[PDB]
Design a protein around this motif. Structure first.
Motif, PDB file in Angstrom:
ATOM      1  N   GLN A  61       0.817  -1.190   0.000  1.00 34.92           N
ATOM      2  CA  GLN A  61       0.000   0.000   0.000  1.00 34.92           C
ATOM      3  C   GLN A  61       0.870   1.267   0.000  1.00 34.92           C
ATOM      4  OE1 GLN A  61      -3.346  -0.316   2.584  1.00 34.92           O
ATOM      5  NE2 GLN A  61      -2.986   1.742   3.444  1.00 34.92           N
ATOM      6  N   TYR A  62       1.916   1.266   0.813  1.00 32.98           N
ATOM      7  CA  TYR A  62       2.822   2.411   0.869  1.00 32.98           C
ATOM      8  C   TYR A  62       3.630   2.610  -0.421  1.00 32.98           C
ATOM      9  CZ  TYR A  62       6.465   5.549   2.760  1.00 32.98           C
ATOM     10  OH  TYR A  62       7.314   6.616   3.002  1.00 32.98           O
ATOM     11  N   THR A  63       3.878   1.532  -1.168  1.00 35.43           N
ATOM     12  CA  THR A  63       4.635   1.638  -2.416  1.00 35.43           C
ATOM     13  C   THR A  63       3.713   1.557  -3.643  1.00 35.43           C
ATOM     14  OG1 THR A  63       5.192  -0.693  -2.800  1.00 35.43           O
ATOM     15  CG2 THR A  63       6.570   0.514  -1.255  1.00 35.43           C
ATOM     16  N   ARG A  64       2.410   1.660  -3.395  1.00 35.40           N
ATOM     17  CA  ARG A  64       1.422   1.781  -4.462  1.00 35.40           C
ATOM     18  C   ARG A  64       1.470   0.590  -5.424  1.00 35.40           C
ATOM     19  NH1 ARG A  64      -0.843   7.367  -4.527  1.00 35.40           N
ATOM     20  NH2 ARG A  64       1.178   8.039  -3.667  1.00 35.40           N
ATOM     21  N   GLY A  65       1.707  -0.598  -4.880  1.00 33.42           N
ATOM     22  CA  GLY A  65       1.805  -1.810  -5.678  1.00 33.42           C
ATOM     23  C   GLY A  65       3.202  -2.118  -6.202  1.00 33.42           C
ATOM     24  N   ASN A  66       4.131  -1.184  -6.039  1.00 36.21           N
ATOM     25  CA  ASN A  66       5.498  -1.386  -6.513  1.00 36.21           C
ATOM     26  C   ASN A  66       6.257  -2.495  -5.761  1.00 36.21           C
ATOM     27  OD1 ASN A  66       8.286  -1.154  -7.196  1.00 36.21           O
ATOM     28  ND2 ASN A  66       8.043   1.019  -7.708  1.00 36.21           N
ATOM     29  N   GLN A  67       6.205  -3.707  -6.306  1.00 34.37           N
ATOM     30  CA  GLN A  67       6.923  -4.848  -5.739  1.00 34.37           C
ATOM     31  C   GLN A  67       8.418  -4.619  -5.525  1.00 34.37           C
ATOM     32  OE1 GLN A  67       6.160  -8.614  -7.551  1.00 34.37           O
ATOM     33  NE2 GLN A  67       3.937  -8.451  -7.288  1.00 34.37           N
ATOM     34  N   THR A  68       9.039  -3.843  -6.397  1.00 30.69           N
ATOM     35  CA  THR A  68      10.479  -3.643  -6.328  1.00 30.69           C
ATOM     36  C   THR A  68      10.846  -2.819  -5.098  1.00 30.69           C
ATOM     37  OG1 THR A  68      10.549  -3.726  -8.755  1.00 30.69           O
ATOM     38  CG2 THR A  68      12.522  -2.834  -7.615  1.00 30.69           C
ATOM     39  N   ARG A  69      10.190  -1.663  -4.972  1.00 34.90           N
ATOM     40  CA  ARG A  69      10.423  -0.761  -3.851  1.00 34.90           C
ATOM     41  C   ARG A  69       9.959  -1.418  -2.558  1.00 34.90           C
ATOM     42  NH1 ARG A  69       9.736   3.814  -2.287  1.00 34.90           N
ATOM     43  NH2 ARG A  69       7.588   4.366  -2.892  1.00 34.90           N
ATOM     44  N   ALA A  70       8.832  -2.124  -2.620  1.00 29.86           N
ATOM     45  CA  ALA A  70       8.398  -2.953  -1.501  1.00 29.86           C
ATOM     46  C   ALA A  70       9.547  -3.829  -1.003  1.00 29.86           C
ATOM     47  CB  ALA A  70       7.201  -3.823  -1.905  1.00 29.86           C
ATOM     48  N   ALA A  71      10.065  -4.673  -1.887  1.00 27.68           N
ATOM     49  CA  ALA A  71      11.125  -5.594  -1.505  1.00 27.68           C
ATOM     50  C   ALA A  71      12.363  -4.883  -1.006  1.00 27.68           C
ATOM     51  CB  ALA A  71      11.478  -6.536  -2.647  1.00 27.68           C
ATOM     52  N   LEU A  72      12.603  -3.669  -1.472  1.00 26.49           N
ATOM     53  CA  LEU A  72      13.805  -2.978  -1.016  1.00 26.49           C
ATOM     54  C   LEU A  72      13.590  -2.503   0.409  1.00 26.49           C
ATOM     55  CD1 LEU A  72      14.621  -1.084  -4.281  1.00 26.49           C
ATOM     56  CD2 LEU A  72      16.060  -2.785  -3.137  1.00 26.49           C
ATOM     57  N   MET A  73      12.429  -1.891   0.601  1.00 22.07           N
ATOM     58  CA  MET A  73      11.990  -1.382   1.877  1.00 22.07           C
ATOM     59  C   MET A  73      11.995  -2.459   2.956  1.00 22.07           C
ATOM     60  SD  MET A  73       8.689   0.944   2.376  1.00 22.07           S
ATOM     61  CE  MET A  73       8.579   2.028   3.805  1.00 22.07           C
ATOM     62  N   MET A  74      11.677  -3.698   2.579  1.00 25.94           N
ATOM     63  CA  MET A  74      11.642  -4.804   3.544  1.00 25.94           C
ATOM     64  C   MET A  74      12.985  -5.482   3.823  1.00 25.94           C
ATOM     65  SD  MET A  74       7.956  -6.356   2.707  1.00 25.94           S
ATOM     66  CE  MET A  74       7.980  -7.995   3.420  1.00 25.94           C
ATOM     67  N   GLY A  75      13.943  -5.328   2.916  1.00 27.37           N
ATOM     68  CA  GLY A  75      15.226  -5.984   3.084  1.00 27.37           C
ATOM     69  C   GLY A  75      15.203  -7.422   2.599  1.00 27.37           C
TER      70      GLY A  75
END
Lengths: 91, 98
Positions: A61-75
DNA sequence: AAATTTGTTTGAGTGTTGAGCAAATTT
DNA sequence: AAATTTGCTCAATGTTCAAACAAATTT
């Protein structure tokens, strides 16, 4: 100090933070109480499911569906993240 | 005869609602809120270990409560958590629980 | 003294990881 | 039209796992 906290209220209507870990403890104290000696079997997968779901939900939700940025944000790895999304049927 | 108890309702927490009434809400919701406050407090640098962060925050109390329940019995602990006794020892080490 | 658990190794299978790449999609 | 992201491989290093088994401990 703690980055992961939740909001609480007392009898005096004061709002105060408390670490998420305190919530987890509570949920488990209640869980263990409710069952008198019945066996527990997959408590790690149970807790993990309960915690991974709203975590993916919040960072997708915070990355607006962006799986890439999601995965970066999570480590974690973009593939791992695709995996976890599929596991909880959110994709 | 048996009322359904959905998974979100197995691990719950005491909350107060809009009418000053004590009610159980899922542990899911506690996680959500913690994460909402964490995102809000982000003004606004990069994060690179949100999974390890959340995971530690959750594994600690889980290990803590299960050991207390099994009175230090690592074998029973591992059985009721559903993981190998080796990784239980690993996790306990990681958090200094010995 | 019997039964259980702890502490440790060992080797197989499963998982996470990066990297790469055409197709799709967003900018 | 450029840049970014998706979806999908592959194989490589790491983690989890059960199975031992003697030593320690708990029943």
């Amino acid at each position: 100090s703690d980055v992961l906290t939740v909001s609480t209220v007392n009898s005096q209507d004061q709002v105060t933070q408390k670490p998420l870990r305190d919530s987890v403890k509570q949920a488990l104290k209640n869980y263990f109480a409710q069952l008198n000696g019945q066996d527990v079997n997959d408590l790690y997968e149970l807790v993990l499911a309960e915690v991974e779901q709203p975590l993916l939900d919040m960072v997708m939700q915070y990355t607006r569906g962006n799986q890439t940025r999601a995965a970066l944000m999570m480590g974690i790895n973009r593939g791992t993240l695709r995996k976890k999304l599929k596991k909880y049927g959110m994709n």
